[PDB]
Subunit: 26 residues, 3 copies
Amino acid sequence: AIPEAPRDXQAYVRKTPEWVLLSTFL
Amino acid sequence: AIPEAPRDXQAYVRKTPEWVLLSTFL
Amino acid sequence: AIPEAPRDXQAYVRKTPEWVLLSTFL
């Protein structure tokens, strides 16, 4: 099942099996 | 287990253990 | 539980209880 995102104070989006940083888009 | 986002029709990103509105980044 | 996003190499965010493409909000 998908896990919690990193406990790192960064926003993530979902892409295939990954949490990916929103800052890679914006 | 990761819980659902608010049932409000808006886009949320995952930031640590919180759903945060995408619009706050825009 | 929140399921996996569509496995297609595109970024998704949560909109209520569904995964919706990030691009649709930008």
